[PDB]
From a paper:
The colE proteins are nonspecific DNases, which are produced by [name] to eliminate neighboring bacteria. To avoid autotoxicity, the producing cells co-express Im proteins, which tightly bind and inhibit colE’s activity. Our results demonstrate that the design of substantially different backbone conformations, orientations, and sequences at the binding site generates dozens of new interaction pairs from a single starting one.
In both structures, the conserved hotspot region formed as predicted. To test whether cognate affinity could be improved, we focused on [name]/[name], which exhibited KD = 73 nM and at least three orders of magnitude pairwise specificity relative to colEwt2/Imwt2. Furthermore, the high-specificity design, [name]/[name] showed high accuracy throughout loop I (0.5 Å Cα rmsd over all Im side chains). Due to backbone preorganization, the designed polar interactions can only form accurately in the cognate pairs as seen in the crystallographic analysis of the high-specificity pair [name]/[name].
Residue numbers in the entry:
A (entry chain C): 2 to 88
B (entry chain B): 4 to 129
The structure:
Amino acid sequence: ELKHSISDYTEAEFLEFVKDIFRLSRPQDNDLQIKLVLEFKRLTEHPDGSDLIYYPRSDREDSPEGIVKEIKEWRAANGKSGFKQGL
Amino acid sequence: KRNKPGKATGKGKPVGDKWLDDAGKDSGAPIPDRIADKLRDKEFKNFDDFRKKFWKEVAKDPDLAKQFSKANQRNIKDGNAPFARESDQVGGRTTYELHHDKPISQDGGVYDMNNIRVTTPKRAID
């Protein structure tokens, strides 16, 4: 029942997705890593793209949790569709 | 070539808190001298093997590892080259790269750490 936009993810689901990115740090996983980073850029549509992960702003937490919060707050304030609510 | 085993040589350069920053500027950044000290007379299977062990040594050196975000620290702890900033990326090339400064003249020149620079993809071109 496949997910195509960020509205198809609950917050915890998208959080886990971002954690997966952090964990795919082995050279043997490069292909999956780049593909999940692309998908992340497509789903978020955030203008910093991969920098949210790898070059975060300094005044929020450098963690997948801090990334999701910045994405939620950003999508909210530009009137864009959010995460699937609750579950 | 990159694919032939050999032994690393040379000293590198002293480096500070802005090392990684310099990698994104003209000619990139040197191999840090304290990393060269760790790699200097070791035998490598190929350049790929060198790169992997380079990044792993960068991870173990707190004053270099602190220059990267947490996701990139995970990359380098595993010997995987770290993701560059979007502005430093060139299409398909997303990671910091290692490149040679001078034409390779002699045997084992692939592993001369006097002549290797760490660069963003954007600065690899030269």
